[PDB]
Amino acid sequence: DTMKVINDPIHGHIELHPLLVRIIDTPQFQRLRYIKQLGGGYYVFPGASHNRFEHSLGVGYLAGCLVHALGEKQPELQISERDVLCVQIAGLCHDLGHGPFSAMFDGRFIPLARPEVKWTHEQGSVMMFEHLINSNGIKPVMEQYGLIPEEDICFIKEQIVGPLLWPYKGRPENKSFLYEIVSNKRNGIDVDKWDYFARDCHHLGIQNNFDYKRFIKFARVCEVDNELRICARDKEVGNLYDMFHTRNSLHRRAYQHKVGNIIDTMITDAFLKADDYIEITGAGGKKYRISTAIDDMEAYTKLTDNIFLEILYSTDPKLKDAREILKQIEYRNLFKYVGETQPTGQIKIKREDYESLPKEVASAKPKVLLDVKLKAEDFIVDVINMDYGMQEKNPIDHVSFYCKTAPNRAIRITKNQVSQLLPEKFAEQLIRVYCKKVDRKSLYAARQYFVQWCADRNFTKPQDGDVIAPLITPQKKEWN
Amino acid sequence: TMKVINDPIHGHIELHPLLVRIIDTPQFQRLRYIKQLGGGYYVFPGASHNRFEHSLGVGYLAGCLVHALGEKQPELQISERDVLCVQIAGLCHDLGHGPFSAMFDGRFIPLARPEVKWTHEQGSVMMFEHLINSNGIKPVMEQYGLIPEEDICFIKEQIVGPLLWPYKGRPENKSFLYEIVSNKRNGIDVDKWDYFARDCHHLGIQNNFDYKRFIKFARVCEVDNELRICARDKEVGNLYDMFHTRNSLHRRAYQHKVGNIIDTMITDAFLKADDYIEITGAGGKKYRISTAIDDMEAYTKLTDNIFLEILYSTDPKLKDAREILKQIEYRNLFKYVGETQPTGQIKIKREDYESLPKEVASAKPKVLLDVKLKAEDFIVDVINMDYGMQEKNPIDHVSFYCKTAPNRAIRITKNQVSQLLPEKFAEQLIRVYCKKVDRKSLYAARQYFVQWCADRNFTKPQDGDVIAPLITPQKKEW
Amino acid sequence: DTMKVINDPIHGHIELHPLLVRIIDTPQFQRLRYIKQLGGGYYVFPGASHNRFEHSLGVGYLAGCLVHALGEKQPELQISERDVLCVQIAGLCHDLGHGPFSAMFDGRFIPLARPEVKWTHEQGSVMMFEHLINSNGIKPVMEQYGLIPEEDICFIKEQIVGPLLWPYKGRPENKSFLYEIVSNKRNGIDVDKWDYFARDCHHLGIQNNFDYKRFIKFARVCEVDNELRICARDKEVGNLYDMFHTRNSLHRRAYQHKVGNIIDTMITDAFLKADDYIEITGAGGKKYRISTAIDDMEAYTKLTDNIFLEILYSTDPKLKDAREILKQIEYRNLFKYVGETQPTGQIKIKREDYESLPKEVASAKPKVLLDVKLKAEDFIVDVINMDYGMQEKNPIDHVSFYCKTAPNRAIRITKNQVSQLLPEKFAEQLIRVYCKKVDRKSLYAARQYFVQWCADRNFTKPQDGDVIAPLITPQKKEW
Amino acid sequence: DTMKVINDPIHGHIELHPLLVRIIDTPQFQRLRYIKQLGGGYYVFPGASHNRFEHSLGVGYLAGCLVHALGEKQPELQISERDVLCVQIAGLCHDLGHGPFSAMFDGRFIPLARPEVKWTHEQGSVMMFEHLINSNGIKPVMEQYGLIPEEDICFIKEQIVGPLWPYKGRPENKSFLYEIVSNKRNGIDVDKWDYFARDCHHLGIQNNFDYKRFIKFARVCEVDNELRICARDKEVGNLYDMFHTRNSLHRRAYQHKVGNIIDTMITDAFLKADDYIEITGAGGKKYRISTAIDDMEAYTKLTDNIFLEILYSTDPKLKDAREILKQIEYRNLFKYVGETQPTGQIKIKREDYESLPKEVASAKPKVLLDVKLKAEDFIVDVINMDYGMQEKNPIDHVSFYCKTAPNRAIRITKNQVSQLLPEKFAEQLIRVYCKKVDRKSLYAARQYFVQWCADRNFTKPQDGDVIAPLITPQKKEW
Ligand SMILES: Nc1ncnc2c1ncn2[C@H]1C[C@H](O)[C@@H](COP(=O)(O)NP(=O)(O)OP(=O)(O)O)O1
Ligand SMILES: Nc1ncnc2c1ncn2[C@H]1C[C@H](O)[C@@H](COP(=O)(O)NP(=O)(O)OP(=O)(O)O)O1
Ligand SMILES: Nc1ncnc2c1ncn2[C@H]1C[C@H](O)[C@@H](COP(=O)(O)NP(=O)(O)OP(=O)(O)O)O1
Ligand SMILES: Nc1ncnc2c1ncn2[C@H]1C[C@H](O)[C@@H](COP(=O)(O)NP(=O)(O)OP(=O)(O)O)O1
Ligand SMILES: [Fe+3]
Ligand SMILES: [Fe+3]
Ligand SMILES: [Fe+3]
Ligand SMILES: [Fe+3]
Ligand SMILES: [Mg+2]
Ligand SMILES: [Mg+2]
Ligand SMILES: [Mg+2]
Ligand SMILES: [Mg+2]
Ligand SMILES: [Mg+2]
Ligand SMILES: [Mg+2]
Ligand SMILES: [Mg+2]
Ligand SMILES: [Mg+2]
Ligand SMILES: [Mg+2]
């Protein structure tokens, strides 16, 4: 059991302490090799073959860089070797709970398959971590390196998911800044983002403009309303606004690419159709479904992107409907993108209303004669909440800064102290509509229903509206 | 025959022999001795690159864009002659830059000769004329199918704009050709694409705009009776990002507060040297640094080397200028005091710039001060940051097409894209510096500065509470 | 109907003609999304997650760049749009025959599982291409775009695998240069190498020093012994030696990494143990095994890296032995590397002798006290043939060059006309030894047998010889 | 008084201790901003605008990374903060002695201008460092941060230029510290790692050596009673590749035939200017270009600027020098005729270089020729290509360790690595050029050249059968 060096193309040669190597070399960690980081995005950006495994190594590594850098510059914080290891382990294990195709599984499939549960991959990560530890004899290995499992397991879990006065048990207040490394609940400025920006960009073929290494150099811990927090140099404020701008830009260009999303939707659909028939063996030989494997970590261990191919290659007549959806993916007979719009004014589309939207689009009465009627079943309506990670809030209002002439003194910097060219709002909704019927006449009709629906709901005019529905767009006074 | 040249940004590029003849002149080779980012090199040490290599890059990209349009749309009748003219314009577009590039036309000439309205682009047109005439290039143009009466004019118009349909070099059915090198309608041009990529490579800041993607999706469509370059509808987000990147490169690098003060110091040294340096132009006439812009033979010999000519001089008359450049090398720079912006609808007008150091020195901070500072001790640098068209959204001046009707041009408004985009497209930054560098002068300069910000109802400096703790409580709006 | 653009991180935005899009959007092509380019190398270099799919797009694209560039510079060659499409399709389809974990499948598994057949992934690519065309109605689509399927399918196949006097039917000798793009049988200078150099490096985190774009700019077709062939500028000769040096260096640093190879070996072992029990359905419902799916393209279509996980997640008691080997991979209880050596002198280890080598290692008699005796079954001996792509030959002796003052005149350039610092030989063998028993005492013993065996065979001294076997290495004066 | 961070595109954000900042902010250091790293190479590779200044920052930084990494992994070595600063200073100052156009100045000009002296830029760096320290009051600043100037100045100089135990600055138990900046035992030093990475970034050729990996695997072990830097055994292949890369960068870039002829032309102009240019040194004494190396105050003012000072001069005495530089700017370069190498055991010695143009002109090609050419018309450039230690394999002078005994040093021979490695480690290339550029002179120059190769039993030029079809059949060995 000695330290390993591993060559990562994003971070270079990184060092893994032998405790981390023991954690990595388990079935529960290695599972992340079989889950694509960007899910259906690989079917649009062919360089995006990367898996959660390598992202997880990167987050472990960066978490270690940030806590080491803080410890070197500020010995008064009393960051111990034990703290450093716990922060690295949390970085390493933070995404253990992702399911097949990553964001698809907790963003689309589980909410549709099991609308009663409130589940996130982060909860999965905590449960999977527990199962990793318990089934591989890791507690004695922790003790061998000076960790205290009652306290430190709890600390690690709290870093990943948040709390399970001062709500944490794993560390006291004098170590609060340690909870801001892996997953920053105050403002989202965390090393998870820095790894995925750099790694996704390298694979996508879109270039990263955020400099995380610069941020680490300028980061300090300062007292802010009587808690010790990570603060940035004042002159980095512009770079932080740019960080969130980059995040939003990566969601627009890649993560919410309209076809990447429809592939995720189709896979979700196939999983919903397969769910009654696929059996996954968990603890004590009990049988779980795709939707219930989240309840038993032994089952969930075996639930990866492989399930796609298990369905695609099946012959069972019961899986026929699921299998045909995946066949449609491989022949590229995808549901067709019709367009994009947004609400106007103070209108917000609520999650309770999502299910009713296909019916609304099909009920629009385009004032043009139509040969084809389309039914609700024929439309998909995907509502995407785009923000700066804190709903309507400006995350930079929850960051603290310091100045070169008083480096222990935290200050606030407001938006108006930076620039007038920044966003005026921090949240918005995009609505994408697609049609399951792909023939030319159905598609012409779907465009008319769509643009009419936008007019009826007082949504923004689709960008191509005048071209795809020339007879509809003149009817709307606010569009001309 | 063609030459190949290896550029680190674009790879191996081909130069037509007419371009090679233009490059191999004193007028073009001059660009090897003018830093792209001027004083920026004194802050970002990778930014050693010169205007020469930027110019090759713009020539190359100009050629890629016009070739791509011609291949996709043969009905436009883009000729080999048109391609060469566009390449030449890209190659020669920055011939007019002076020592330290933006410093020379942005700071020095306006101060040295406030009566003239000069730009490097005007310089590029005059330098091009002088390059052609003094190196026998007109017959070589003819040899390759160009018509110099028409094409020289076309080339110049591409660089500087017009010298109803205001252009003589090409008719309306070729208006798109004027949108490649320097796009007067919206600023979306290959010059930006080269400098984004090249500056980033050298600065150590990463480029996020994909120019190659833009070229693939570009088409020419009819818009209000002219053939113009349009982009695919779905690229609109990427164009907003393009201008966001431009603004971000100005914030991080080009307007870095110390890069600018170095540019200011060099400008100061040039103003102090201007009466004493003689540069010989055409017919043996004698020019100064500030007048060499009137004669391209003189201007040919004015490059960044003038910095070292002053620094190494022994002439007592250049003592004052020389001492400023010595201060740069010891890093005894004028000191940054801080940054602020106007509030509300307030605009600082160019006529008022000269009065601002006096205003800062006239502030009466209610604080005990060892030193009184005079107007001459402050520099107040006002920077106009925008999306290239003052208050306007340049995306309102772009045309788009949709996949289902690719010959039909459309407009896309800001509200059709995103609510997270900027609400304004122009703003002003105000940096204040002090020429007196000792600890007590600097403490005082901070008090005058923050008090001035309070008095003018400008934004609170980011470090205001720390540098002037007794001043910032006075102002209710902070 | 129309062209698609696709964004690749290595080549940027590439354009795909609609005929290529029809070929790509088939089960037979999309299969390549589930086959890792570097196989077991992903278990060593975590950035090497890339699959054969994206490599195939890249080779298609570069094949098109090279043939377009030749056509633009030399209209007299009469390169047609039809030729361009055929070269693109060949580049796109060249690796359709790879199996699970790529080089593992044709380099290790098939040779062990079916030693009677002479099979390569390239043969697989030809058969898979035939099956792709026939089962997706591609022939009429080819006709729609000006291709002539009798001739052009044959041309495409020949570009991939070679011939199936002038031995080719798809194109004549005045177009011989077209066979030098995707897979160059004369000297190995082909666009396949250029894509994988660039793509592997980007993912591995090792940097590429070969500039393929420069090579394309300087490439011309010239007459050489009555065939039209691709020639390089004279002054590029250095860069071509560097190309093969880079290839060799990527094999040393990554592709033949000792642990990447042992993982490939372990997976192969698990597949051999699973082979009797896994059923893959092929044409007419017939059942194939892992080792026989190469005989039926409908079965082979469904044979990808997924088989690893099918074994790993199985519960069938019959798959227990295969499953346990894959569990050993996941816990990193790997067969242990003992060391590396090479033959000396004139000695060449022949393929017929590979199987006898573990027995030789176990028969060595190290004069050292050992608690554990090891048997032949405990050693793995992996022999790797490292060369410049043409066994003992210098591939640069099979390249033609031209000079700036006579660009249509082909010439030869010998090694002595370039540099005295170049390699003296172009082939060698590396011998890696591993031990299947992983405890510290077995490993100590394995090192003594290994170093003694090297001494006995007069192989090169292992680099760490003095440290791992201090009592053995003094016996050998020449060490 | 506080640390500075600087953004370099090769190494990222690097930290500079305030003592380093004081050294950098002097005229003697800042001088390096005006000397191109690759000299005339910029006139072939237009991305290669980089100067010695940024290379020097990089070497300072890497020197610091290597010594820090050794200290972190091996606390028993007792590397102090003082040792780290001294190694950084040496890295930073190691190239202070370069002259105009870098390798051109000490490789071509000084040897020709002053054949009696044995001068290297490294000697210059030591003298320039001494002058930097003494004229900027640096010794008290060193003391303020824990350095001992009697000892540490000596240590710093020994690291730059070299020397029982021959060093005075540090004892044997710290010998490894002398292997960071300039490694005299085998050449594996951080100077190479910076220039590989930085040159590649600017040239547009990609670097394949991973220096960071080497740093991770580097350890100090006892070797024949000295503590030395050793590499992991399995890195041996990577080290052979390192020297292969060095050779490959010399072939592609640094010894590019046209880059060298430009260096030669500039050298020629400097030789013609040398009697007439005056550079003021200490106490107002006057130096020449060739003598400015004797006085650091003069040498401080000798940079690439001298090129433009000559080009723009009007003095009649500089006419010949000026005309050569004009020929560079119009691209009327001496023409490359070809390349060959000696055969067998033959080595061309430096004493014989001057006689070679005469030999080429004395060859008697049995061919009808329009022009007879004289010795003065040919340039013969002889280049020594090696792995940095003449005929020796530098890997024979490296020590390694194994994972199972990391404190135990071992040797690894070439046969333990690969049969595909080089069989020799040194060779000579001979390039011939002609000063007469017309077609008939050039035809003749090719005939003399190929005949000369045949007469001396040199290798057949690669294009020999094409440029001299009547000459190459005479030689049986071809
Ligand atoms: N020459 C090279 N260049 C770059 N990366 C390389 C490399 N060789 C390997 N890597 C990558 C592969 C891995 O990501 C990492 C480590 O590979 P090893 O350093 O080969 N270490 P291992 O555990 O095999 O040997 P041991 O136990 O004897 O120390 O570097
Ligand atoms: N091996 C190499 N690899 C990469 N870039 C290179 C290179 N060699 C040169 N460059 C860069 C340097 C230049 O930017 C460009 C062209 O250099 P040449 O191809 O050397 N052309 P020249 O005009 O000397 O030879 P001729 O007239 O005989 O064809 O490539
Ligand atoms: N903003 C962006 N920047 C870079 N690459 C991008 C990108 N957006 C997509 N890609 C990549 C993803 C793909 O690899 C490629 C094409 O994506 P689309 O241009 O979005 N084309 P699609 O076929 O969806 O829309 P249509 O049929 O309406 O033209 O570019
Ligand atoms: N946003 C940015 N991104 C990347 N590099 C940047 C940068 N801004 C500056 N640089 C580069 C330029 C330099 O190479 C380096 C340091 O520039 P500053 O951090 O601005 N430091 P200074 O001394 O001006 O301010 P103070 O004294 O208040 O700390 O970073
Ligand atoms: Fe994550
Ligand atoms: Fe420009
Ligand atoms: Fe391939
Ligand atoms: Fe150096
Ligand atoms: Mg997560
Ligand atoms: Mg998060
Ligand atoms: Mg301009
Ligand atoms: Mg412009
Ligand atoms: Mg502006
Ligand atoms: Mg293949
Ligand atoms: Mg091959
Ligand atoms: Mg040196
Ligand atoms: Mg050296």
Numbering used by the authors:
A (entry chain A): 113 to 276, 284 to 599
B (entry chain D): 114 to 276, 284 to 598
C (entry chain B): 113 to 276, 284 to 598
D (entry chain C): 113 to 275, 284 to 598
Sentences from the paper on this structure:
Sterile alpha motif and HD domain-containing protein 1 (SAMHD1) is an important regulator of cellular 2′-deoxynucleoside-5′-triphosphate (dNTP) in mammalian cells. Although the HD-domain contains the active site, dNTP hydrolysis requires assembly of SAMHD1 into homo-tetramers. Using combined biophysical and X-ray structural studies incorporating nucleotide analogues along with mutagenesis experiments we have now discovered that SAMHD1 uses a bi-metallic Fe–Mg centre to catalyse dNTP hydrolysis in a reaction similar to those catalysed by HD domains in both human and bacterial phosphodiesterase PDE enzymes.
In our proposed mechanism, His215 is the general acid that stabilises evolving negative charge at the O5′ during the ES to EP transition and likely protonates the O5′ on the 2′-deoxynucleoside leaving group. However, no measurable triphosphohydrolase activity could be detected for the H215A mutant, even when elevated levels (10 µM) of H215A–SAMHD1 were employed in the assay, confirming its critical function in catalysis. In the structure, the bound active site dAMPNPP nucleotide adopts the same configuration as that observed in the wt and D137N structures. In addition, the active site side chains, metal ions and water molecule positions are also maintained in the same positions as in the wt active site further supporting His215 function in catalysis at a stage subsequent to tetramer formation and binding of the substrate. In addition, we solved a further structure of the catalytically inactive mutant H215A, which does not disrupt metal ion binding, with dAMPNPP bound in the active site. In all our structures the active site side chain configurations, nucleotide conformation and metal ion–water network are all conserved, including in the H215A structure.
